[PDB]
Amino acid sequence: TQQFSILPGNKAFKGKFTVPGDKSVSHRSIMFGAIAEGTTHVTGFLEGEDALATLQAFRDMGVSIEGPKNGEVTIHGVGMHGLKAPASALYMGNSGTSMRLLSGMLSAQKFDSVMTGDASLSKRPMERIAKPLRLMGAQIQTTGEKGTPPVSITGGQQLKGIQYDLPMASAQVKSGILLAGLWAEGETSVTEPEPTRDHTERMLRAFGYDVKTEGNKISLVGGGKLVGTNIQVPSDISSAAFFMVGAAITEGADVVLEAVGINPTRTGVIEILKQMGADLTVENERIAGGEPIADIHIKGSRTLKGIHMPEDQVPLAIDEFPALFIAAACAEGQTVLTGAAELRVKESDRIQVMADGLKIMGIDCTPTEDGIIIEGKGKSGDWSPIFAGGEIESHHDHRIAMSFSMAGLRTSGPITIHGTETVATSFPTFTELANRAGLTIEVSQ
Ligand SMILES: [Cl-]
Ligand SMILES: [Cl-]
Numbered sequence: 001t002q003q004f005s006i007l008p009g010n011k012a013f014k015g016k017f018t019v020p021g022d023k024s025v026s027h028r029s030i031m032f033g034a035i036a037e038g039t040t041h042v043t044g045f046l047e048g049e050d051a052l053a054t055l056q057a058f059r060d061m062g063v064s065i066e067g068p069k070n071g072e073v074t075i076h077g078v079g080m081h082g083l084k085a086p087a088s089a090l091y092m093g094n095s096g097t098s099m100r101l102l103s104g105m106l107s108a109q110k111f112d113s114v115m116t117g118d119a120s121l122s123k124r125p126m127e128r129i130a131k132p133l134r135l136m137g138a139q140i141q142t143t144g145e146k147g148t149p150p151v152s153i154t155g156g157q158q159l160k161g162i163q164y165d166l167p168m169a170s171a172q173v174k175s176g177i178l179l180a181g182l183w184a185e186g187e188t189s190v191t192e193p194e195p196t197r198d199h200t201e202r203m204l205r206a207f208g209y210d211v212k213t214e215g216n217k218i219s220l221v222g223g224g225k226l227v228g229t230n231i232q233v234p235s236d237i238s239s240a241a242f243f244m245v246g247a248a249i250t251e252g253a254d255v256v257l258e259a260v261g262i263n264p265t266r267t268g269v270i271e272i273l274k275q276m277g278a279d280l281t282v283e284n285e286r287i288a289g290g291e292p293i294a295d296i297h298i299k300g301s302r303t304l305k306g307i308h309m310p311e312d313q314v315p316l317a318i319d320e321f322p323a324l325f326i327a328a329a330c331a332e333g334q335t336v337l338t339g340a341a342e343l344r345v346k347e348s349d350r351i352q353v354m355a356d357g358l359k360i361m362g363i364d365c366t367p368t369e370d371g372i373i374i375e376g377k378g379k380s381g382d383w384s385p386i387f388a389g390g391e392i393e394s395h396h397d398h399r400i401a402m403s404f405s406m407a408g409l410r411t412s413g414p415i416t417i418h419g420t421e422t423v424a425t426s427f428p429t430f431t432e433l434a435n436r437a438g439l440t441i442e443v444s445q
Contacts (some may be wrong), residue, residue, distance in 0.1 A: 002421035004401060004431075005442040006408030008389060012438035013250040013300070013409060018258045019240045020428055021046035021071060021233040024097075025261070026290060027054055027232045028203035031101060031179070033075035034058040034065075035083065036207050038228035042073040044259075045233055048425070053095040057102060060086040077228045080183070080206075085111035088149070092117045097172055099151065100129045101200075104176035106153045107138035108183035108237060122149050129176040132164050136177075136184055161222055163188035169194035174218065181206040181222050182209070189219035195315055197248065197265045199291075206231065206290030224253040232288040234261030238399075239427050241269045241320040244298050246406045246439065248278045251383035253300030255437065259288075260296045268317025270296070272324060276304045276331060303383075304328075306335035306376045314340050322403040325354050329363045330386045330410055332378040337371030344369070353393070353400050361407060362388035389413025398426040405441055 003284050021044040030051060033040035047055070047068045059065060062084035067073040090106075092099045092115055099115050103126065106113045124363035127147035130140045161184045164177060174190045178200065181188025193216070201211045201218060208227040211220045225362075240260045247255040262270070262282065273280050279299040286293060304327055314337075317324065321343060328335035337343075344351050344367075351367045358365050363386075364375040389411045394401035396419040408415050420443070423430055431441045 001419055003282050003444050004405055004420045005444060006405065006411070006415040007440070008385070008411050008413050011250060011409050013246055013253040014255060014395070015437050016256045016258060016432050017243065017436065018191040019235045019243070019433065020162055022199075022236040022261050023048045023050065024197065024199045025203065025233050025289070027051050027097065028059065028199055029233065029289070030054050030073070030075065031105070032203055032226055033077055033205045033228065033231070034063045035080055036077035036226035036228040037079055040075040040076055040077055040228040040231060042075070042231045042233060043071060044235065045071045045073050046236070049093060050095045050097045050383055053098040057086070057090045057098065060090060068238045075228070077226070083109055086113055087236045089114040089116045089206070092121060094118050094120050096121055096124050099126065099149065100172040101179060103129050103140065103151060103153070104133060104178070104180035107133050107140055107157070108157045108159050108180050111155040113153045113155070115149060115153070117149050117334040120370060124148060126151055126168065128168065129173045130161065132162065132173070132177050132389070133293060135164070136160055136180055136188070138180065154169065159184035159222070161188035163189045165191045169196050171196040171198070171200065175200040175389040178211070178218065178220060181220055183338070186220045187219055189217060191217045195265065197263070202263070202290040204426045234288060235259050235265075235289040237261045237263075237266050237269070238319050239430070240296060241323050242298060242402050242406055243281065243433065243437065244269060244273060245323045245327045246409055246437070247298035247300055248273060248280065248302045248304055248327055249386070249406070250409045253298065255298045257296040257298070259293045262292050262294045265316060268313040269320040269324065271313045271319055272309055273327065275307050275310060276327060277302060278304060295375055303378050303380045304331035305378070306331045306333035306374065309335065309337045311339040319399060320344065322350055322354050322399045323406065325358065325372070326403050326406050328374040328376055329358060330378050331376035332380055335374040335376060338368070340371040341369060343371065348395070348397060350397065350400065351366065352398060357400070357404050358391045360390040360392060362413070385412035387412070387415075389415045392417045394419045396422050398422040402427060402430055405430075405439070408441070409439055
């Protein structure tokens with residue numbers, strides 16, 4: 001166990017900062033850089049659980065890779081057919097993402113493969129991706145009735161593109177199918193019943209592959225070719241969100257977050273904060289590595305106010321609601337969240353864990369079946385403490401820990417957050433940026 005400690009008192013919160021690279025986009029650059037023609041140089045790379053497992057997999061399959069080192073990776077791509085058979089099982093650790101995306105890719109290879117995982121991944125079913133791949137002609141075996149790992153794939157198959165109506169929305173399953181479709185005969189198409197992130201699609205385009213996005217119908221034609229290029233990874237908006245919130249709840253705060261990724265499938269926190277009356281502007285908009293980026297300028301010039309959060313932004317801000325709950329508490333009036341049933345018990349009930357911590361800090365809130373109700377203690381023009389402090393349980397959820405860390409900007413008492421050791425893995429520079437901004441956080445045993 002590890003814990004964060006924060007002391008009460010009027011904090012400053014200002015500066016120009018760049019948060020770490022987007023987790024998902026970092027991963028995709030490896031997926032496609034490995035099988036592209038020529039060299040790929042990646043910058044702003046953040047290696048997470050997914051990246052490291054995928055990095056090792058392609059190393060095992062003969063790909064030469066320098067790094068990651070200081071956010072830089074050089075990938076000597078081997079072309080669409082340059083992968084070599086792994087000498088043993090490809091260990092995925094806890095990366096279900098790696099396993100699902102590589103399933104599609106591996107099911108199209110000449111050679112056999114086995115994918116295995118740790119105790120947690122070994123329990124996760126893989127039939128939602130395996131089933132459509134089998135329709136394409138893939139030979140993919142799973143374990144037991146629930147179809148969990150190990151996932152055993154037989155190569156040397158001829159895949160055919162299918163038109164697939166996805167029963168349950170999933171960027172991972174969607175991505176797995178499309179990746180197999182790169183080697184398949186004809187067009188592979190996925191129709192998702194609900195909108196998901198499109199980092200896979202955008203990275204494919206960055207590498208020169210044509211991908212049609214036509215409403216909820218996402219498709220490509222197999223036989224194409226990927227071309228190595230330079231990939232600047234956008235900084236993670238999910239990481240930036242904590243400092244957006246911090247700036248919006250701190251008096252006279254002035255924060256510029258540079259090169260923040262603003263993929264429209266990820267920008268829900270911006271729209272929501274804006275609707276809460278936040279002084280938040282999006283300037284210097286441009287594109288890097290097929291991803292849109294911008295500088296986010298947030299000022300604590302006025303008091304947030306509680307709103308009925310827009311339901312059309314919930315899919316776009318799903319991971320940012322723990323941070324937004326902190327904003328809601330400092331806001332004037334009541335905040336209500338609906339249509340966020342996904343947010344409850346998604347193998348971790350963030351609504352309740354936040355509620356527990358918020359209540360400990362003296363905030364009247366109430367979990368609902370599809371969200372939460374928060375009674376904000378904010379008052380227009382008033383920047384007196386909102387939170388009472390206390391001891392907080394994060395349950396090793398980094399987003400919970402980082403959220404309650406921001407609460408230290410408006411607390412009348414000490415805050416101790418337990419189980420914060422996963423914060424550094426997700427957001428390595430979090431406490432550093434916090435300190436540079438004016439939010440001192442002491443890490444302990
Ligand atoms: Cl994605
Ligand atoms: Cl998460």
